Design a protein around this ligand. Structure first.
Ligand SMILES: [Ca+2]
Length: 283
Protein backbone atom coordinates (compact mmCIF):
# COMPACT_ATOMS: atom_id res chain seq x y z
CA UNK A 1 0.00 0.00 0.00
CA UNK A 2 0.97 3.63 -0.56
CA UNK A 3 2.35 5.41 2.52
CA UNK A 4 1.21 8.86 3.70
CA UNK A 5 2.89 10.72 6.54
CA UNK A 6 1.47 13.37 8.85
CA UNK A 7 3.41 15.93 10.84
CA UNK A 8 1.65 16.66 14.14
CA UNK A 9 0.94 20.35 14.79
CA UNK A 10 -0.94 20.32 18.10
CA UNK A 11 2.12 20.99 20.26
CA UNK A 12 3.28 24.12 18.44
CA UNK A 13 0.85 25.30 15.72
CA UNK A 14 -2.11 24.22 17.85
CA UNK A 15 -1.14 25.67 21.23
CA UNK A 16 0.06 28.83 19.49
CA UNK A 17 -3.45 29.37 18.12
CA UNK A 18 -5.16 29.20 21.50
CA UNK A 19 -6.01 32.21 23.72
CA UNK A 20 -4.54 30.56 26.82
CA UNK A 21 -1.33 29.28 28.34
CA UNK A 22 -1.11 25.54 28.81
CA UNK A 23 0.96 24.55 31.87
CA UNK A 24 4.44 23.36 30.91
CA UNK A 25 3.83 20.00 32.55
CA UNK A 26 0.69 19.66 30.45
CA UNK A 27 2.53 20.48 27.23
CA UNK A 28 5.09 17.81 28.13
CA UNK A 29 2.40 15.25 28.91
CA UNK A 30 0.72 16.07 25.61
CA UNK A 31 3.90 15.59 23.61
CA UNK A 32 4.74 12.30 25.37
CA UNK A 33 1.39 10.85 24.29
CA UNK A 34 1.82 12.01 20.70
CA UNK A 35 5.26 10.35 20.68
CA UNK A 36 3.57 6.99 21.28
CA UNK A 37 1.20 7.52 18.39
CA UNK A 38 3.62 6.52 15.64
CA UNK A 39 4.58 9.90 14.12
CA UNK A 40 7.99 10.21 12.44
CA UNK A 41 8.05 13.98 13.02
CA UNK A 42 6.56 16.16 15.76
CA UNK A 43 6.99 19.93 16.03
CA UNK A 44 7.60 20.24 19.77
CA UNK A 45 7.67 24.05 20.16
CA UNK A 46 8.85 27.39 18.80
CA UNK A 47 11.73 29.66 19.87
CA UNK A 48 9.99 32.86 18.84
CA UNK A 49 9.62 36.05 20.90
CA UNK A 50 7.66 35.30 24.10
CA UNK A 51 5.93 38.66 23.67
CA UNK A 52 4.61 37.81 20.21
CA UNK A 53 3.52 34.34 21.31
CA UNK A 54 3.55 33.86 25.11
CA UNK A 55 1.77 30.54 24.65
CA UNK A 56 5.15 28.91 23.91
CA UNK A 57 7.43 30.96 26.15
CA UNK A 58 8.32 27.71 27.93
CA UNK A 59 9.81 26.25 24.74
CA UNK A 60 13.11 25.66 26.55
CA UNK A 61 11.65 23.70 29.47
CA UNK A 62 9.46 21.68 27.11
CA UNK A 63 12.37 20.42 24.97
CA UNK A 64 14.12 19.50 28.20
CA UNK A 65 11.21 17.71 29.86
CA UNK A 66 10.03 15.74 26.82
CA UNK A 67 11.21 12.15 26.41
CA UNK A 68 12.98 11.28 23.14
CA UNK A 69 11.45 8.12 21.68
CA UNK A 70 14.68 8.11 19.61
CA UNK A 71 12.75 6.83 16.60
CA UNK A 72 10.97 10.19 16.39
CA UNK A 73 12.34 13.52 15.18
CA UNK A 74 11.41 16.55 17.29
CA UNK A 75 11.56 19.82 15.35
CA UNK A 76 11.09 23.42 16.42
CA UNK A 77 10.06 26.59 14.54
CA UNK A 78 12.82 29.18 14.18
CA UNK A 79 12.17 32.91 13.43
CA UNK A 80 15.81 34.02 13.23
CA UNK A 81 19.42 33.22 14.05
CA UNK A 82 18.88 33.86 17.76
CA UNK A 83 16.16 31.21 17.58
CA UNK A 84 18.37 28.75 15.76
CA UNK A 85 20.93 28.91 18.57
CA UNK A 86 18.28 28.13 21.17
CA UNK A 87 17.02 25.28 18.98
CA UNK A 88 20.55 23.86 18.72
CA UNK A 89 20.94 24.20 22.49
CA UNK A 90 17.60 22.42 23.03
CA UNK A 91 18.94 19.52 20.96
CA UNK A 92 16.32 19.91 18.25
CA UNK A 93 16.41 17.10 15.66
CA UNK A 94 15.11 19.31 12.86
CA UNK A 95 14.33 22.94 12.13
CA UNK A 96 11.39 24.75 10.52
CA UNK A 97 11.30 28.30 9.11
CA UNK A 98 8.34 30.34 7.94
CA UNK A 99 7.42 32.91 5.32
CA UNK A 100 4.30 34.11 3.57
CA UNK A 101 3.23 34.03 -0.07
CA UNK A 102 1.30 37.27 0.62
CA UNK A 103 3.09 40.63 0.99
CA UNK A 104 0.34 42.05 3.18
CA UNK A 105 0.40 39.13 5.58
CA UNK A 106 4.19 39.14 5.76
CA UNK A 107 4.61 42.75 6.83
CA UNK A 108 1.78 42.10 9.29
CA UNK A 109 2.98 38.83 10.81
CA UNK A 110 6.77 38.97 10.39
CA UNK A 111 6.75 42.74 9.96
CA UNK A 112 8.73 42.84 6.71
CA UNK A 113 8.39 42.05 3.00
CA UNK A 114 8.50 38.57 1.52
CA UNK A 115 11.85 39.19 -0.16
CA UNK A 116 13.27 40.54 3.13
CA UNK A 117 12.02 37.56 5.10
CA UNK A 118 13.81 35.32 2.60
CA UNK A 119 17.11 37.22 2.85
CA UNK A 120 17.23 37.14 6.64
CA UNK A 121 16.36 33.44 6.55
CA UNK A 122 19.24 32.75 4.17
CA UNK A 123 21.83 32.63 7.00
CA UNK A 124 19.75 30.65 9.50
CA UNK A 125 19.07 27.95 6.91
CA UNK A 126 22.78 28.01 6.16
CA UNK A 127 23.72 27.52 9.79
CA UNK A 128 21.30 24.60 10.01
CA UNK A 129 22.61 22.83 6.92
CA UNK A 130 26.11 23.26 8.32
CA UNK A 131 25.11 21.51 11.56
CA UNK A 132 23.47 18.71 9.57
CA UNK A 133 19.94 19.62 10.68
CA UNK A 134 17.00 19.10 8.34
CA UNK A 135 15.03 22.28 7.56
CA UNK A 136 11.44 22.56 6.35
CA UNK A 137 9.82 25.77 5.23
CA UNK A 138 6.29 27.01 5.88
CA UNK A 139 4.47 29.16 3.32
CA UNK A 140 1.32 30.94 4.52
CA UNK A 141 -1.60 32.22 2.47
CA UNK A 142 -1.09 29.73 -0.38
CA UNK A 143 -4.67 30.27 -1.49
CA UNK A 144 -5.95 33.46 0.08
CA UNK A 145 -4.78 36.17 2.45
CA UNK A 146 -7.00 37.91 4.98
CA UNK A 147 -5.27 41.08 3.77
CA UNK A 148 -4.57 40.94 0.03
CA UNK A 149 -7.35 38.51 -0.81
CA UNK A 150 -6.62 35.72 -3.33
CA UNK A 151 -2.96 34.88 -3.90
CA UNK A 152 -1.87 33.75 -7.36
CA UNK A 153 -0.37 30.26 -7.86
CA UNK A 154 2.69 31.95 -9.31
CA UNK A 155 3.31 33.94 -6.14
CA UNK A 156 3.25 30.73 -4.10
CA UNK A 157 5.50 28.88 -6.57
CA UNK A 158 7.97 31.77 -6.51
CA UNK A 159 8.58 31.76 -2.75
CA UNK A 160 8.41 27.96 -2.62
CA UNK A 161 11.19 27.71 -5.25
CA UNK A 162 13.35 30.17 -3.31
CA UNK A 163 12.95 28.20 -0.06
CA UNK A 164 14.14 24.97 -1.68
CA UNK A 165 17.02 26.78 -3.42
CA UNK A 166 18.20 28.01 -0.01
CA UNK A 167 18.25 24.47 1.33
CA UNK A 168 14.85 23.47 2.69
CA UNK A 169 14.24 19.75 2.08
CA UNK A 170 10.47 20.20 2.28
CA UNK A 171 7.88 22.97 2.07
CA UNK A 172 4.48 23.01 3.74
CA UNK A 173 1.85 24.87 1.72
CA UNK A 174 -0.56 26.27 4.27
CA UNK A 175 -4.08 27.51 3.59
CA UNK A 176 -3.79 29.98 6.50
CA UNK A 177 -7.44 31.08 6.62
CA UNK A 178 -8.96 27.88 5.33
CA UNK A 179 -10.60 29.46 2.32
CA UNK A 180 -9.16 26.93 -0.10
CA UNK A 181 -11.34 24.70 -2.27
CA UNK A 182 -10.41 21.71 -4.44
CA UNK A 183 -10.10 24.10 -7.41
CA UNK A 184 -7.95 26.91 -5.96
CA UNK A 185 -5.80 24.33 -4.17
CA UNK A 186 -5.40 22.38 -7.42
CA UNK A 187 -4.33 25.49 -9.31
CA UNK A 188 -1.83 26.31 -6.58
CA UNK A 189 -0.30 22.82 -6.52
CA UNK A 190 0.07 22.82 -10.32
CA UNK A 191 2.21 25.92 -10.17
CA UNK A 192 4.32 24.52 -7.31
CA UNK A 193 4.64 21.08 -8.92
CA UNK A 194 6.16 22.81 -11.94
CA UNK A 195 9.21 23.85 -9.87
CA UNK A 196 9.38 21.13 -7.22
CA UNK A 197 8.57 17.40 -6.93
CA UNK A 198 5.49 16.27 -5.00
CA UNK A 199 7.86 14.30 -2.79
CA UNK A 200 9.06 17.46 -1.03
CA UNK A 201 5.64 19.07 -0.59
CA UNK A 202 3.43 18.95 2.46
CA UNK A 203 -0.19 20.04 2.65
CA UNK A 204 -1.33 22.22 5.55
CA UNK A 205 -5.05 22.83 5.11
CA UNK A 206 -7.32 24.40 7.70
CA UNK A 207 -10.82 22.97 8.02
CA UNK A 208 -12.16 26.41 8.90
CA UNK A 209 -14.37 26.23 5.83
CA UNK A 210 -15.05 22.50 6.11
CA UNK A 211 -13.00 21.65 3.03
CA UNK A 212 -9.70 20.48 4.55
CA UNK A 213 -10.36 16.78 3.83
CA UNK A 214 -11.43 17.69 0.29
CA UNK A 215 -8.26 19.72 -0.33
CA UNK A 216 -6.23 16.79 0.95
CA UNK A 217 -7.83 14.39 -1.57
CA UNK A 218 -6.86 16.73 -4.41
CA UNK A 219 -3.29 16.89 -3.05
CA UNK A 220 -3.15 13.08 -2.92
CA UNK A 221 -4.33 12.95 -6.55
CA UNK A 222 -1.56 15.40 -7.39
CA UNK A 223 1.11 13.32 -5.66
CA UNK A 224 1.49 14.83 -2.19
CA UNK A 225 2.20 12.25 0.51
CA UNK A 226 2.65 14.48 3.59
CA UNK A 227 0.10 16.55 5.46
CA UNK A 228 0.02 18.64 8.63
CA UNK A 229 -2.76 18.27 11.18
CA UNK A 230 -3.62 18.69 14.89
CA UNK A 231 -4.64 15.62 16.87
CA UNK A 232 -7.81 17.20 18.25
CA UNK A 233 -8.04 20.19 15.97
CA UNK A 234 -5.95 22.25 18.39
CA UNK A 235 -5.30 25.80 17.30
CA UNK A 236 -8.21 27.69 15.78
CA UNK A 237 -8.28 30.66 13.42
CA UNK A 238 -7.91 34.24 14.78
CA UNK A 239 -9.83 35.66 11.82
CA UNK A 240 -12.58 33.16 12.61
CA UNK A 241 -12.76 32.87 16.45
CA UNK A 242 -14.41 29.71 17.73
CA UNK A 243 -14.41 28.42 14.14
CA UNK A 244 -12.51 25.22 13.27
CA UNK A 245 -8.76 25.74 12.89
CA UNK A 246 -6.28 23.06 11.85
CA UNK A 247 -7.64 19.88 10.30
CA UNK A 248 -8.18 17.20 12.99
CA UNK A 249 -5.39 14.58 12.79
CA UNK A 250 -7.91 11.81 13.56
CA UNK A 251 -10.28 12.75 10.77
CA UNK A 252 -7.36 12.75 8.31
CA UNK A 253 -6.00 9.31 9.22
CA UNK A 254 -9.45 7.69 9.29
CA UNK A 255 -10.05 8.97 5.75
CA UNK A 256 -6.54 8.08 4.54
CA UNK A 257 -6.92 4.49 5.72
CA UNK A 258 -10.32 4.21 4.03
CA UNK A 259 -8.47 5.15 0.85
CA UNK A 260 -6.10 2.27 1.38
CA UNK A 261 -3.29 4.53 2.55
CA UNK A 262 -1.02 3.50 5.41
CA UNK A 263 -0.01 6.15 7.93
CA UNK A 264 1.70 3.93 10.49
CA UNK A 265 -0.25 5.70 13.24
CA UNK A 266 -2.29 4.20 16.07
CA UNK A 267 -5.89 5.49 15.89
CA UNK A 268 -6.62 4.50 19.49
CA UNK A 269 -3.61 6.43 20.74
CA UNK A 270 -4.57 9.31 18.44
CA UNK A 271 -8.12 9.50 19.78
CA UNK A 272 -6.81 9.36 23.31
CA UNK A 273 -4.42 12.22 22.52
CA UNK A 274 -7.23 14.29 21.05
CA UNK A 275 -9.35 13.86 24.16
CA UNK A 276 -6.32 15.03 26.10
CA UNK A 277 -5.94 18.23 24.10
CA UNK A 278 -9.66 18.85 24.41
CA UNK A 279 -9.06 19.09 28.16
CA UNK A 280 -7.22 22.32 27.32
CA UNK A 281 -9.06 23.34 24.14
CA UNK A 282 -12.35 24.22 25.83
CA UNK A 283 -10.65 25.15 29.10
CA1 LIG B 1 -2.17 25.85 11.02
Amino acid sequence: AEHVEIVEMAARDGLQNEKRFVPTADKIALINRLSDCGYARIEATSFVSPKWVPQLADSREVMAGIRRADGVRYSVLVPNMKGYEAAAAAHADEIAVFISASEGFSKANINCTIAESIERLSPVIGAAINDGLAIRGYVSCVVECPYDGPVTPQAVASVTEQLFSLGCHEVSLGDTIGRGTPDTVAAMLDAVLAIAPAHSLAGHYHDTGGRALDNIRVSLEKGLRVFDASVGGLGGCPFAPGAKGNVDTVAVVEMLHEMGFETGLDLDRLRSAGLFTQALRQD
